[PDB]
């Protein structure tokens, strides 16, 4: 596993942190991760262009799931999922690069470099997956069978990546499931977490479609779908004790999207 020089500093792993702090933390993680050697070659500029600035919400989901689960039980030195959250945003951003293709990513650099970049981000996302496993192996000796669980994570992210054409759901599935097994070597209720991620990604996509006196409803029907899926997701969350105070901020951000606020 090729190594870096530094990623994060002054981090309290299990502290209860709000979305903004989590966001600032992941931005420092992402920026530091560029520099220490991830995107070498002529595609150094493309990726950096694409990733810099964003909602970062999928990696944030990952990280909060892990920190919350680690509160419950620990395996010797709390797990702060950085390389894995990196990988989450990598996959999701590569999807975006591909979606914009025939300003944009392919505008400033060319469609050729655009797809070359997308492949680079997916590739080194898996590479940082393996890197997170290696970090776990060094600092977490009690962690249950890291090799098998890491292979299973790669397998699920695999199956999800090819099952994209909605297309917004699978990346949230990646975030949730990865954060679930990395917060705890469980695979005890992964399907429940699948329905949780699915409901949440559904509500997110619908809120995004709704984003702006035509009798066109206010598509109050679609809002009912959004809030119903959000309810069921919260039900699973508080059904596994990881429904923290972040999820309040997150749910209301989603809702305020659909409300025009």
Residue numbers in the entry: 31 to 132, 144 to 206, 215 to 261, 270 to 318
Please give the exact wording used by the authors of the publication that reports this structure.
Previous studies have confirmed that the B318L protein encoded by the ASFV represents a new member of the viral PT family, according to sequence alignment and a follow-up enzymatic assay. These experiments have shown that the B318L protein catalyzes the condensation of isopentenyl diphosphate (IPP) with allylic diphosphates to produce C20-geranylgeranyl diphosphate (GGPP) and longer chain prenyl diphosphates. Taken together, these experiments indicate that B318L is an essential gene for viral replication.
For crystallization, the N-terminal putative transmembrane region (residues 1–30) was truncated. Thus, the truncated form of B318L (residues 31–318) was expressed in E. coli. In this study, taking advantage of an accurate model predicted from AF2, the crystal structure of the B318L protein was successfully solved by MR at 3.2 Å. The overall structure of B318L adopts a canonical all-helix fold and contains 11 helices (A to K) which can be divided into three layers. The front helical layer is formed by helices A, B, and E. The front layer is orthogonal to the other layers. In the middle layer, there are helices C, D, F, I, and K. The conserved Asp-rich motifs FARM (residues 129–135) and SARM (residues 257–261) are located at helices D and I, respectively. The remaining helices G, H, and J, surrounding the catalytic core, form the back layer. However, there are three loop regions (S133 to K143, Q209 to P214, and H262 to N269) that could not be built due to the lack of interpretable electron density. The most significant difference is the various conformations of their N-terminal extensions, where the N-terminus of B318L starts with a long loop, whereas helices are observed in the N-terminus of other GGPPS. Since the experimental structure inherently belongs to the apo form of the B318L protein, its protein-ligand contact area is much closer to the apo templates.
